[PDB]
Enzyme design. Structure first.
Site, short mmCIF file in Angstrom:
data_model
loop_
_atom_site.label_atom_id
_atom_site.label_comp_id
_atom_site.label_asym_id
_atom_site.label_seq_id
_atom_site.Cartn_x
_atom_site.Cartn_y
_atom_site.Cartn_z
N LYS A 47 10.75 -3.90 -20.42
CA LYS A 47 11.27 -3.13 -19.31
C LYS A 47 12.37 -3.90 -18.56
O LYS A 47 13.35 -3.31 -18.13
CB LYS A 47 10.12 -2.77 -18.37
CG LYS A 47 10.46 -1.90 -17.18
CD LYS A 47 10.72 -0.47 -17.61
CE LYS A 47 9.77 0.53 -16.95
NZ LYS A 47 10.35 1.12 -15.72
N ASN A 71 16.22 -2.63 -17.82
CA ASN A 71 16.74 -2.68 -16.47
C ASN A 71 17.94 -3.61 -16.30
O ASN A 71 18.86 -3.33 -15.53
CB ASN A 71 15.64 -3.09 -15.49
CG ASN A 71 14.66 -1.97 -15.21
OD1 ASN A 71 13.49 -2.21 -15.00
ND2 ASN A 71 15.14 -0.76 -15.19
N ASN A 82 20.74 -0.96 -15.02
CA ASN A 82 20.98 -1.16 -13.60
C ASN A 82 22.28 -1.91 -13.35
O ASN A 82 23.14 -1.47 -12.62
CB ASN A 82 19.85 -1.95 -12.95
CG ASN A 82 18.73 -1.06 -12.47
OD1 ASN A 82 18.91 -0.22 -11.61
ND2 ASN A 82 17.56 -1.29 -12.99
N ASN A 135 6.01 -3.83 -10.52
CA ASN A 135 7.05 -3.71 -11.54
C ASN A 135 7.89 -4.99 -11.53
O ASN A 135 7.86 -5.75 -10.55
CB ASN A 135 7.96 -2.50 -11.25
CG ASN A 135 7.19 -1.23 -10.91
OD1 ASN A 135 7.25 -0.74 -9.78
ND2 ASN A 135 6.46 -0.68 -11.88
N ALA A 152 0.82 -1.20 0.00
CA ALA A 152 0.00 0.00 0.00
C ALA A 152 0.85 1.26 0.00
O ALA A 152 0.58 2.21 0.72
CB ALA A 152 -0.97 0.00 1.18
N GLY A 153 1.87 1.27 -0.85
CA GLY A 153 2.58 2.50 -1.15
C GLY A 153 1.68 3.48 -1.87
O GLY A 153 0.44 3.45 -1.75
N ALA A 154 2.31 4.36 -2.63
CA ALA A 154 1.63 5.45 -3.30
C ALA A 154 0.53 4.93 -4.22
O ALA A 154 -0.60 5.42 -4.20
CB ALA A 154 2.64 6.27 -4.11
N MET A 155 0.90 3.95 -5.04
CA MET A 155 -0.01 3.45 -6.05
C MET A 155 -1.17 2.69 -5.43
O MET A 155 -2.32 2.96 -5.72
CB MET A 155 0.75 2.53 -7.02
CG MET A 155 1.61 3.28 -8.03
SD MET A 155 0.61 4.23 -9.16
CE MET A 155 -0.47 2.92 -9.75
N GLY A 156 -0.84 1.74 -4.57
CA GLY A 156 -1.85 0.95 -3.89
C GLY A 156 -2.83 1.79 -3.10
O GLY A 156 -4.01 1.52 -3.09
#
Lengths: 311, 312
Positions: B189, B193, B197, B107, B11-15
């Site tokens: 993606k 990465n 990365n 992601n 439940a970060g920003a997106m959640g």
């Protein structure tokens, strides 16, 4: 048996060979690019310090390669892998009488380098356990005794082997013919291609490498490819023996706290010997249709690191 | 019944933004998260949502740690990062016995395989989204613009009612559609990465410095040609050439020349990297499909050694 001899690369080892060969009755020229060393030898003699602490001073002939106008029966090459092509280039005029060329330089694409400058059947490879220390310009410190092992690159066309051995032995250098010299050089290149390269990539010392939880996989990845290329090249090689030798370096009392030469090269922004280590196995594997994707990639990573280090 | 019982796992920003919208639309929502300050703030003072006009909106929401969850759900929407996802699903084991729909919007690229160990694969749906959200602090997000979601069932011939899931999302204004290019987009993606990365981390350089390397093309091809071979064997659309052009587009200062990618910051902070879900994942999957991946396997090992050294 005597020869007229040039020592090309007159560091610690070359200077010691030169003195012994001159004292034995051979005519010797020391050839080197380090000016302070060439000047000191000609201006004050070559100082050789023995175990008893006595300084011995010898009159020796030293020259920069471009200044050399004499020709020789034998060239003994000690020049490092990466300097060797430039040195031979500068000696082009010296080489036209087709001398024996004996390479005692450490490392493993030396034959191929030499082949671009002299016919391959005049090439001999060697190892030695004679030691010597370079204290300063025109000054070496020496101890102990030694021997040399020699192998003609093209044994069925090299006419001079007996003469070469007789001349070196008459100087007390203890030389003999052997068929496993190129194998011994490969074995050392195996050790160097694991320890130098990974320590450089990881900015770590030899003990830190040996403490890695994946040190065995990293080592196998490199050495299994070495094994495959050596097999195709018909050079005796044992991944397992090289592995035991690598592991023997790990303890503090051996090399645990030492950073290998490639690591110091990188740290000083000097170009590394990668193209004569992992890069040489990759290039030779390419020529023999043996896949070497790990060694090829490690070579690229080192080249990138070199480029970044000079920003 | 548009009315679903929904859990937002991660439940970060997106959640949090998805959750508020789904609750306000008439669904019952539980926010599931491991960050205590966040879970406490939400339960004690509500979730603060700041819109473009700078107005702070406060909503009453239910938040819990995964260990505490006893409710069961019709749908789990997963935002949890690749590396945390197995632990999260482990902690929810008792909750999963009613066989919920599992929608992963996380992601990265080995998420399906992770999820498969906890729920039957035919309940799995993968998705991408361009909704944005910023995590300003515990119990506080800042949001802007609009968005959409693209969804692809992992087993399309056995996932019954994708349309129902879309109806529920759309009744909450989330603008979802069915598509079948989602798995390809995730692979694409992962390609980018696994070059940027990983090499930036090994070389301790930024994206522009990588692009200035005289051998950047060989390094990129070495990784991407293996990606292409594994994608081919897996029957997933992939174009090494298009991924290469996308990578190259990052190099200029005007784009990402002076940025250090996430794995480089992870290494710098002695955090474990996501290597086993980048180069490591292609290597493992290539192994399973008899496709040689010696470059990606070695790069994985190098990154593991670097992590080990970084904690001395």
């Amino acid at each position: 048996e005597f020869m007229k001899i040039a020592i090309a690369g007159a560091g610690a080892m070359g200077s010691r060979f030169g003195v012994k060969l001159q004292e034995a009755g051979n005519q010797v020229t020391l050839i080197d690019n380090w000016s302070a060393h060439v000047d000191q030898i000609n201006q004050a003699g070559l100082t050789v310090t023995t175990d008893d602490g006595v300084d011995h001073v010898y009159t020796m002939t030293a020259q920069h390669p471009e200044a050399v106008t004499d020709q020789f029966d034998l060239i003994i090459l000690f020049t490092k892998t990466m300097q060797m092509d430039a040195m031979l280039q500068q000696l082009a005029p010296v080489l036209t009488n087709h001398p024996i060329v004996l390479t005692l330089a450490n490392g493993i694409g030396n034959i191929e380098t030499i082949e671009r400058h002299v016919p391959k059947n005049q090439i001999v490879v060697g190892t030695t356990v004679w030691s010597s220390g370079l204290t300063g310009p025109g000054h070496i410190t020496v101890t102990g005794t030694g021997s040399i092992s020699l192998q003609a690159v093209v044994p069925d066309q090299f006419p001079n082997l007996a003469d070469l051995i007789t001349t070196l032995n008459a100087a007390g250098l203890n030389a003999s013919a052997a068929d496993n010299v190129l194998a011994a050089i490969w074995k050392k290149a195996g050790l160097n291609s694991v320890l130098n390269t990974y320590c450089t990539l990881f900015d770590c010392n030899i003990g830190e490498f040996g403490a890695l939880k994946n040190w065995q996989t990293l080592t196998a990845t490199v050495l299994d490819e070495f094994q495959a290329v050596a097999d195709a090249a018909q050079i005796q090689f044992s991944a397992a023996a090289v592995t035991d030798w690598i592991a023997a370096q790990f303890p503090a009392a051996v090399n645990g706290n030492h950073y290998p030469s490639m690591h110091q090269d990188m740290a000083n922004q000097r170009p590394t010997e990668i193209d004569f280590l992992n890069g040489y196995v990759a290039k030779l594997g390419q020529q023999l249709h043996v896949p070497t994707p790990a060694n090829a990639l490690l070579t690229q990573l080192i080249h990138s690191q070199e480029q970044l280090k000079q920003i």
